[PDB]
Amino acid sequence: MRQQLIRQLRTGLGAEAVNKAAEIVRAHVADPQAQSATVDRFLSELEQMAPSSVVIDTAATSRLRAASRQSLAALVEKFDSVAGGLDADGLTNLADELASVAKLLLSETALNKHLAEPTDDSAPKVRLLERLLSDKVSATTLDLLRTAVSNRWSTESNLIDAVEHTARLALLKRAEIAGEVDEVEEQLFRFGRVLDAEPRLSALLSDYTTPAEGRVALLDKALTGRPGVNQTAAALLSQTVGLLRGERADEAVIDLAELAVSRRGEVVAHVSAAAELSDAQRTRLTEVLSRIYGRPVSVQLHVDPELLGGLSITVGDEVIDGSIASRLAAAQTGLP
Amino acid sequence: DQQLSAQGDQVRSGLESSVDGLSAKLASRILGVDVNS
Amino acid sequence: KTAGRVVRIVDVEFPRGSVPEQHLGDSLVRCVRGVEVTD
Amino acid sequence: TAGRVVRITVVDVEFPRGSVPVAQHLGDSLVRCVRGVEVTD
Amino acid sequence: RVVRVEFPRGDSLVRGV
Amino acid sequence: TISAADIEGAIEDYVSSFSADTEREEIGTVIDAAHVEGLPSVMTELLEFPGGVLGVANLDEHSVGFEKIEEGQQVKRTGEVNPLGQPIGQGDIA
């Protein structure tokens, strides 16, 4: 009982001390200036962090296999080459045509199966494509389709996925031409946030059993069709919801935002802060994250009260947890 | 264990004084900066 | 709301974040189709 | 030209299209001899 | 025709003949 | 002969020496339960689930192979008496 008595006394003393430490931490955090100081200190700590060894964060389309990933890389390169001279209206027409072709392929299972089957030679595929829709789509659309089918895809679904990807790229390119890339990025992130906040709406929109036109109309009437919604973001979201094959609506919107930022070469960093940051703090955070990860990063803030201070950054599968609440939890569990 | 219990009660009552200081120190560690309180 | 519905007869689906504390993923848990369910 | 571990349980490795070598050929360039570690023929 | 049988309209899959 | 000095010393040494350095850490998410998605670089390994629970990483391209564990929880990778070696209540074991 002797050593047990010392154990009981130590446990009680430590428990009381840590409870009072939690009280003091919460009291100190009450001051917003304390929050700013904690954020600044965590940033200071970040400056000392070593640059990431895995410069290849990727994860935008990691689900793709090697063969389909290479095919999609070639397809996006071809689209980038083609879209240079095309105009905004031409880009809209291209995006609409590609979305229509994607839904057509999704509807016609046999046609997609035949047109996505890998083969050493592609001439039969090109002939089939031309016979089917030589006239129904413009020259650029037909060229993109022939390039897409020339490559090989691990699974037939990857073909429709690639066509949808190209449509999204066309819409993003027309947004870029107007110089509104940042606006569409912000609108897409906001739409993802609101969809996450209303899981019922996402679940309603995230079923393909019901007609696509009805779901698009619902999206327009509820969320997309509002005075402040950017037109490019509206079109992108409507197209994405139209072409849904079991992916959750909020997940699809987040993927759209990630792809949009990727086109600029940046990477999305979801910083969860206790309270709002300052412009200087935001710039410092962007710089440190960019240098540590080796690529420019766009930062998305998620103000969360219970964080209690600091930041909690997450890029890809990697998380940097500077939250004060985490420190308190560690202290609680770190008792002898 | 009654005598041991007596020492335990007396010593915990006595240590109930300095405990406050410890708390402050712990806060300083998790705040990352010295907290006077 | 935050109340699930019967998917399979029982596999009950819940809105994300409302999953009751066997989880099958995609917010389903194992405990007429579509009837309202609460936890 | 080098593979990369895909599944570990019997290690399912994946090789480029033309560099497939290895107790079985699962097809789609996968053979069945940390995920993602490179594997050389 | 026979697949392993296929009829015009599980899914009718109840070679090439 | 209880040395109140010793009891004070243990806790003050713990508090003064307290340190939790933030580290770039790889996280996955429980998808069902308990398969874990993510954790791309997990070894064939000890994983931490919320509440301090400990599990062992069956690796597949899709997903990796006691407080409550729920779908969506965050799983951390450790990069490496009950069978775990923790005492079960004579105190800590050096």
Place this chain on the structure above:
Amino acid sequence: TISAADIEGAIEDYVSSFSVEGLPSVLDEHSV
């Protein structure tokens, strides 16, 4: 610039609007 009331009204309106395989009111999401 989004109101949850508008979302609720729109989704309820749509639900009213569009409201062994089949037999939904009769066992899983696919078939009896």
Place this chain on the structure above:
Amino acid sequence: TISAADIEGAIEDYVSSFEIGTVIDAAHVEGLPSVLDEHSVGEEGQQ
């Protein structure tokens, strides 16, 4: 949008373009339609 129903004929031509089988598993061989199920016939890539 766009719609088409004559596609049924078009695809025929494509499949009519092509017998040689290719080993996919090992052993299963895809192809040899006139030669054991729809997917395949009961070193990968060999002809």
